[PDB]
Amino acid sequence: STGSATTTPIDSLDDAYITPVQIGTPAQTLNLDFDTGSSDLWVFSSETTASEVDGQTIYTPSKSTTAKLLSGATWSISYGDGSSSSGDVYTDTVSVGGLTVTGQAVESAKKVSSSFTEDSTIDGLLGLAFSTLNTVSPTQQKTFFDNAKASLDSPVFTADLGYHAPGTYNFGFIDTTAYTGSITYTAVSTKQGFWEWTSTGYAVGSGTFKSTSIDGIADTGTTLLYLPATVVSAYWAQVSGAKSSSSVGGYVFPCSATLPSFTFGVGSARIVIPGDYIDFGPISTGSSSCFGGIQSSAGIGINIFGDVALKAAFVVFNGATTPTLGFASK
Numbered sequence: 001s002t003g004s005a006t007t008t009p010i011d012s013l014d015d016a017y018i019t020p021v022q023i024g025t026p027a028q029t030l031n032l033d034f035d036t037g038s039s040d041l042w043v044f045s046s047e048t049t050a051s052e053v054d055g056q057t058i059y060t061p062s063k064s065t066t067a068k069l070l071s072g073a074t075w076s077i078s079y080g081d082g083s084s085s086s087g088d089v090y091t092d093t094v095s096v097g098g099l100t101v102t103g104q105a106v107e108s109a110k111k112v113s114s115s116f117t118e119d120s121t122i123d124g125l126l127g128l129a130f131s132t133l134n135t136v137s138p139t140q141q142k143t144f145f146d147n148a149k150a151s152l153d154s155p156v157f158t159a160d161l162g163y164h165a166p167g168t169y170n171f172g173f174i175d176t177t178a179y180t181g182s183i184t185y186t187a188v189s190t191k192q193g194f195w196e197w198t199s200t201g202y203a204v205g206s207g208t209f210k211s212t213s214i215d216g217i218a219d220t221g222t223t224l225l226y227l228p229a230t231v232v233s234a235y236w237a238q239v240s241g242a243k244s245s246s247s248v249g250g251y252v253f254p255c256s257a258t259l260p261s262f263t264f265g266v267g268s269a270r271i272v273i274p275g276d277y278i279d280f281g282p283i284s285t286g287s288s289s290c291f292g293g294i295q296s297s298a299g300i301g302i303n304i305f306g307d308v309a310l311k312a313a314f315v316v317f318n319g320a321t322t323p324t325l326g327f328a329s330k
């Protein structure tokens with residue numbers, strides 16, 4: 001089997017991407033944030049604290065003839081931005097782009113933090129990291145991809161994120177029309193539960209390539225590109241007037257600037273992030289100070305190849321017995 005679903009930016013900055021997901025019988029369609037940096041499928045629901053719901057579409061398991069309470073199971077998660085959610089668990093039929101998993105753990109939110117409430121466009125998360133990160137207790141659950149894998153034509157999914165435009169998540173096949181050149185594959189460590197790999201280096205604009213190993217994760221659930229402070233300083237030094245702002249929370253630059261591109265290595269191959277991809281707009285409405293899309297990972301504890309980087313490529317998440325990651329230009 002295969003599935004293919006369009007993913008759509010939630011706003012004009014590509015702050016995140018939402019993909020429609022069919023849950024239950026009859027289907028309840030919710031727009032979820034496909035997250036290769038986590039491993040829980042959780043939704044806003046009829047169980048969510050009423051004052052914590054504002055505009056989201058909710059899952060109502062009592063309206064689904066195939067929902068079953070997973071008795072005794074609970075879940076609790078917190079993300080790198082300090083956001084969190086928690087609740088209980090149902091199993092139900094979940095379909096993505098025509099690919100159907102029965103018996104999928106659907107984690108029903110009772111509680112969500114303010115960031116979630118405040119974003120009416122995201123109805124929940126669909127985690128696509130490894131199932132060892134799943135937070136259900138006392139019986140850990142599998143991710144949609146792990147449950148689907150044995151059914152798929154090939155044990156892969158691909159992420160093709162758009163720059164200020166829709167893109168695609170495919171399951172079980174590689175669309176050879178969706179990228180240019182060839183796909184370069186690179187090893188993955190599953191030790192921390194992530195799609196963790198090692199970039200071979202970087203370049204700033206038309207600068208020479210610096211060969212250096214950068215361990216990091218491919219994270220569709222993170223907006224920005226988070227890299228070591230040395231790398232990030234080298235980037236922003238090429239932009240007149242850019243500076244790191246403690247008040248704002250990272251590098252800002254004059255909105256009048258033209259940003260340089262940023263190249264990262266994948267083995268011997270190179271992916272180029274155009275400068276416009278690195279512009280996240282005014283720090284506040286009307287400001288002439290703009291927020292940078294490349295930020296330091298110092299204090300995070302990990303380098304993160306978030307949407308700013310991944311949207312510049314066609315990315316293959318190969319879930320074979322020995323997983324690997326593939327990157328192609330597009």
Ligand SMILES: c1cc(CNc2ccc3c(c2)OCCO3)ccn1
Pocket residue numbers: 015016033035037038079080081083115119122125221222
């Ligand atoms: C997974 C989930 C989260 C949850 N927080 C979150 C999700 C989407 C967002 C967001 C915040 O703030 C910017 C707009 O889009 C953050 C990181 N990885």
